[PDB]
Amino acid sequence: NIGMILKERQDGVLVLTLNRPEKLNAITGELLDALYAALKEGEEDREVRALLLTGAGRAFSAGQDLTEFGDRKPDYEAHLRRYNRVVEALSGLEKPLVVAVNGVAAGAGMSLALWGDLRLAAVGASFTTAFVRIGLVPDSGLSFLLPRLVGLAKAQELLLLSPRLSAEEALALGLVHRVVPAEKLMEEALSLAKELAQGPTRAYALTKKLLLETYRLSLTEALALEAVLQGQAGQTQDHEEGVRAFREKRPPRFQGR
Amino acid sequence: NIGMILKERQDGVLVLTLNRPEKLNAITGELLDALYAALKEGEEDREVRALLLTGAGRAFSAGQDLTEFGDRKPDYEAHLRRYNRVVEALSGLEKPLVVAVNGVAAGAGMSLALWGDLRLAAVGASFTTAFVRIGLVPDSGLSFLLPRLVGLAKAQELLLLSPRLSAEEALALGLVHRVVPAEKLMEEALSLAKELAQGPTRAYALTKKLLLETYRLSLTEALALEAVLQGQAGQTQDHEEGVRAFREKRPPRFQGR
Amino acid sequence: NIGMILKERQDGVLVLTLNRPEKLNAITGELLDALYAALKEGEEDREVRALLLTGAGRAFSAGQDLTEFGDRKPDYEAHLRRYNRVVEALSGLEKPLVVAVNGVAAGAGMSLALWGDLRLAAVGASFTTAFVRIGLVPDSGLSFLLPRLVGLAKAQELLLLSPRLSAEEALALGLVHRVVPAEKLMEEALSLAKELAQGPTRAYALTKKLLLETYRLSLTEALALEAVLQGQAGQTQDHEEGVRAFREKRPPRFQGR
Ligand SMILES: CC(C)(COP(=O)(O)OP(=O)(O)OC[C@H]1O[C@@H](n2cnc3c(N)ncnc32)[C@H](O)[C@@H]1OP(=O)(O)O)[C@@H](O)C(=O)NCCC(=O)NCCSC(=O)C/C=C/CC(=O)O
Ligand SMILES: CC(C)(COP(=O)(O)OP(=O)(O)OC[C@H]1O[C@@H](n2cnc3c(N)ncnc32)[C@H](O)[C@@H]1OP(=O)(O)O)[C@@H](O)C(=O)NCCC(=O)NCCSC(=O)C/C=C/CC(=O)O
Numbered sequence: 193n194i195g196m197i198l199k200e201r202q203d204g205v206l207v208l209t210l211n212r213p214e215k216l217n218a219i220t221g222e223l224l225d226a227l228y229a230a231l232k233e234g235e236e237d238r239e240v241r242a243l244l245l246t247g248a249g250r251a252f253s254a255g256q257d258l259t260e261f262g263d264r265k266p267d268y269e270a271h272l273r274r275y276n277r278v279v280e281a282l283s284g285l286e287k288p289l290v291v292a293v294n295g296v297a298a299g300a301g302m303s304l305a306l307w308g309d310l311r312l313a314a315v316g317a318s319f320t321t322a323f324v325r326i327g328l329v330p331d332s333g334l335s336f337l338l339p340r341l342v343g344l345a346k347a348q349e350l351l352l353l354s355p356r357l358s359a360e361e362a363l364a365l366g367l368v369h370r371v372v373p374a375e376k377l378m379e380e381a382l383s384l385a386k387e388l389a390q391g392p393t394r395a396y397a398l399t400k401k402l403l404l405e406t407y408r409l410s411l412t413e414a415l416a417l418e419a420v421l422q423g424q425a426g427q428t429q430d431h432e433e434g435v436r437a438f439r440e441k442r443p444p445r446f447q448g449r
Numbered sequence: 450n451i452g453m454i455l456k457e458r459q460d461g462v463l464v465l466t467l468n469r470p471e472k473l474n475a476i477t478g479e480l481l482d483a484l485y486a487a488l489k490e491g492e493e494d495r496e497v498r499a500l501l502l503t504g505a506g507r508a509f510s511a512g513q514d515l516t517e518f519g520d521r522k523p524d525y526e527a528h529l530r531r532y533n534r535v536v537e538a539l540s541g542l543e544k545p546l547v548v549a550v551n552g553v554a555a556g557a558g559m560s561l562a563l564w565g566d567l568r569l570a571a572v573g574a575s576f577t578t579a580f581v582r583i584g585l586v587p588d589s590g591l592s593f594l595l596p597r598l599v600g601l602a603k604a605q606e607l608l609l610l611s612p613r614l615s616a617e618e619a620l621a622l623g624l625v626h627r628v629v630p631a632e633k634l635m636e637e638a639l640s641l642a643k644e645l646a647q648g649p650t651r652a653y654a655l656t657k658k659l660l661l662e663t664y665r666l667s668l669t670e671a672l673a674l675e676a677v678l679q680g681q682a683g684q685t686q687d688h689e690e691g692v693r694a695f696r697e698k699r700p701p702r703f704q705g706r
Numbered sequence: 707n708i709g710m711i712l713k714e715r716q717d718g719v720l721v722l723t724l725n726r727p728e729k730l731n732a733i734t735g736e737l738l739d740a741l742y743a744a745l746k747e748g749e750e751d752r753e754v755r756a757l758l759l760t761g762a763g764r765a766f767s768a769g770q771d772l773t774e775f776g777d778r779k780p781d782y783e784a785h786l787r788r789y790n791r792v793v794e795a796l797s798g799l800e801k802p803l804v805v806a807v808n809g810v811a812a813g814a815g816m817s818l819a820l821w822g823d824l825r826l827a828a829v830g831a832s833f834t835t836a837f838v839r840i841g842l843v844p845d846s847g848l849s850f851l852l853p854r855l856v857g858l859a860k861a862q863e864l865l866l867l868s869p870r871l872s873a874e875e876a877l878a879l880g881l882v883h884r885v886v887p888a889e890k891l892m893e894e895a896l897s898l899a900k901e902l903a904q905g906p907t908r909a910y911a912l913t914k915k916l917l918l919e920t921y922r923l924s925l926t927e928a929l930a931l932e933a934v935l936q937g938q939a940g941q942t943q944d945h946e947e948g949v950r951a952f953r954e955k956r957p958p959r960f961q962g963r
């Protein structure tokens with residue numbers, strides 16, 4: 193398909209599938225533009241309360257297509273302003289994102305997978321940082337996410353030595369939250385995304401903003417931002433519903449506003 | 450008791466007990482003012498070298514009293530400047546704090562428990578972030594503490610899905626340092642707090658300041674603050690005692706100055 | 707030996723050995739000047755692509771020599787500008803550093819060991835923060851490294867209570883990456899350092915810069931620095947070699963430029 197991102201809506205969930213299975217969903221500028229466009233649509237679509245990202249075929253993504261750039265003096269500083277708006281869009285997404293890692297995620301493919309709020313892997317899936325084997329540094333936010341997700345000791349080993357991690361090893365480190373058999377991965381991930389699509393979408397979005405900023409703030413700054421964002425969550429119809437549901441001891445019926 | 454914070458001194462330890470057992474020690478502005486007052490007294494009392502915080506009855510704390518605010522347009526930005534001076538006081542406390550989590554700690558109750566320097570839980574105690582089920586974001590410093598304590602991967606799952614964690618699960622993640630039978634919790638926690646109340650109180654206070662600031666500093670800034678605070682610890686009578694005790698291979702007798 | 711740092715080159719590796727075995731490699735200003743000088747030489751020597759740091763005798767290092775300062779009013783703020791250029795040099799080293807922890811690492815000895823990019827310990831080796839037992843705060847970058855390496859929950863316990871950790875406990879926490887029998891430690895560590903000395907030295911150096919800065923940056927700042935440093939790695943002969951080797955499915959032959 194032109195752009196190489198498949199798009200499907202179900203029950204409040206936009207399902208995005210990386211679709212270059214013949215090249216293990218290797219990333220090109222074209223694929224990144226299509227993914228940006230799809231994330232923008234998902235976020236704008238008032239019928240969408242959650243996103244699910246997965247790969248077509250054997251792989252999640254092998255990362256940058258190492259054929260896309262033809263022997264010329266590479267300008268990665270320039271190009272990464274492109275990987276960069278996609279990462280900006282993922283990081284700031286105002287709806288929850290499930291990632292279903294169906295196979296290998298390497299390099300920027302591993303970066304993209306780790307931007308999921310909740311991450312599931314198939315048995316048989318694998319992670320490898322990859323960049324150092326091409327003489328490159330981690331990019332697409334991997335140098336930001338990895339030490340936060342697995343701690344600095346594991347981030348050093350994973351990045352410097354680029355070992356291949358099994359899905360069970362990934363589970364141990366916090367790279368994923370759940371490992372499921374390959375034939376059940378999309379059912380389980382879609383089940384979780386539909387759960388989140390009934391959730392308090394505004395609370396999810398603002399909680400994600402606090403988590404993104406937490407490490408660079410002083411405690412004083414963190415308490416100030418908590419105050420500001422709790423002010424905004426406090427004004428939502430969902431907060432009022434949440435309080436009613438607790439007082440009546442029934443499930444909340446959230447609307448995402 | 451008026452203010453709902455019980456206060457007792459033993460052997461250098463101020464014991465603070467959240468005391469609204471009939472509402473699972475649910476937090477009100479009144480309780481927060483009483484806790485602030487008690488922390489201020491503990492810190493000012495030269496007979497106190499350590500604090501121990503626990504709950505009365507079944508619960509540690511169920512967090513914000515979801516009856517305190519009566520159907521009016523809530524102003525959480527305003528109110529949190531109140532949760533906020535209490536968190537400021539906890540974070541900056543110039544004496545070590547043990548927390549004994551005797552039962553459920555939910556929402557701001559979980560926030561308060563996690564401000565302990567050393568944290569023990571009873572078998573049967575439990576943690577739940579709770580905020581997202583009311584359509585709110587984590588507050589009272591939970592968005593600051595949780596990713597630092599358990600890493601970002603576990604913080605995402607705990608905050609977005611609000612699962613109930615057993616004391617043994619909490620131990621695994623680093624939410625607590627020790628799990629003990631319910632009938633031994635106060636004996637063990639008081640034993641540890643009395644140990645710290647013989648400790649180098651100034652070294653504890655300055656070590657806590659370094660830990661609070663560590664993530665937002667450059668290595669250059671971190672080394673500069675280490676230099677400044679080690680300068681201050683170096684001038685204490687306790688440092689001179691610590692050096693004598695090491696040279697003579699005997700226990701130090703610290704005074705907290 | 708004058709300066710108490712032994713220096714030996716093998717197969718692209720500068721081997722540095724802390725050499726005051728009679729005082730468990732206890733740190734003095736003189737030892738720190740010698741270590742700074744040795745790190746500077748290793749980094750300047752175009753025949754060196756990796757460093758390995760270890761201890762002579764029983765210990766890795768017992769940390770500051772608690773005989774060096776003679777009963778005078780200590781000025782640790784002044785002196786730490788000395789521990790500080792050594793830590794600055796370690797942190798910014800533009801070649802990978804393996805640490806082989808052959809025995810106890812306490813206080814600043816533990817600080818120094820944890821500056822390794824990859825860390826191995828002998829069975830029988832041990833770690834202890836130590837500072838709090840002398841009434842001091844963690845220094846030599848320990849307040850920076852420890853919470854990043856083991857998370858805040860373990861850093862609090864390790865620093866406030868100064869327990870002695872076995873090599874297997876250290877492995878569990880991420881203080882080291884590998885534990886090996888004492889008689890195999892230098893063979894394994896030298897084997898790993900020779901591996902890294904064939905590696906893409908520029909990618910290692912720039913990856914280390916991203917990891918050092920990651921926690922204090924916004925995601926926007928982190929993506930900007932990734933762009934800048936990937937630009938520089940992209941211009942290296944090693945990047946061009948890495949791409950050729952992947953396209954031909956053969957091992958890269960990196961030069962470190
Ligand atoms: C671990 C995998 C991904 C999978 O192994 P396996 O499943 O055994 O497959 P394979 O290695 O046998 O490859 C099968 C085919 O896919 C191709 N393939 C795999 N990865 C990529 C790839 N990344 N680019 C182009 N082709 C790729 C292979 O070349 C093969 O093609 P062929 O059938 O021989 O024609 C392995 O292929 C691998 O290490 N690939 C390279 C991964 C890699 O280095 N990714 C790029 C890191 S750099 C990055 O992502 C961002 C860089 C930004 C700066 C910039 O460059 O703009
Ligand atoms: C996990 C517990 C805490 C305990 O379960 P369990 O032990 O089975 O007890 P229960 O749920 O059966 O409750 C027993 C009673 O306590 C009451 N209770 C429990 N939590 C609270 C509570 N937080 N507020 C008022 N009442 C509470 C229940 O309503 C019941 O009252 P009743 O006997 O029916 O009259 C459960 O009650 C629970 O999820 N409670 C709500 C926890 C909660 O959402 N906390 C607030 C999060 S929001 C926060 O803390 C800060 C917000 C700041 C912004 C602002 O609002 O200012």
Ligand SMILES: CC(C)(COP(=O)(O)OP(=O)(O)OC[C@H]1O[C@@H](n2cnc3c(N)ncnc32)[C@H](O)[C@@H]1OP(=O)(O)O)[C@@H](O)C(=O)NCCC(=O)NCCSC(=O)C/C=C/CC(=O)O
Nearest residue numbers: 730732768769770771772773782785810812813814836837
């Ligand atoms: C865990 C060890 C390191 C090892 O135990 P073990 O292997 O059983 O040996 P030991 O304790 O029996 O000591 C054997 C000998 O080494 C000496 N030794 C051990 N550590 C040091 C030491 N750090 N300084 C001088 N001597 C030391 C002992 O005093 C003994 O000397 P002797 O044979 O009795 O003459 C234990 O010795 C120990 O706790 N030592 C003190 C560690 C310590 O507190 N280090 C300093 C932390 S403060 C720091 O590093 C930076 C401070 C900067 C501010 C400033 O001061 O400038």
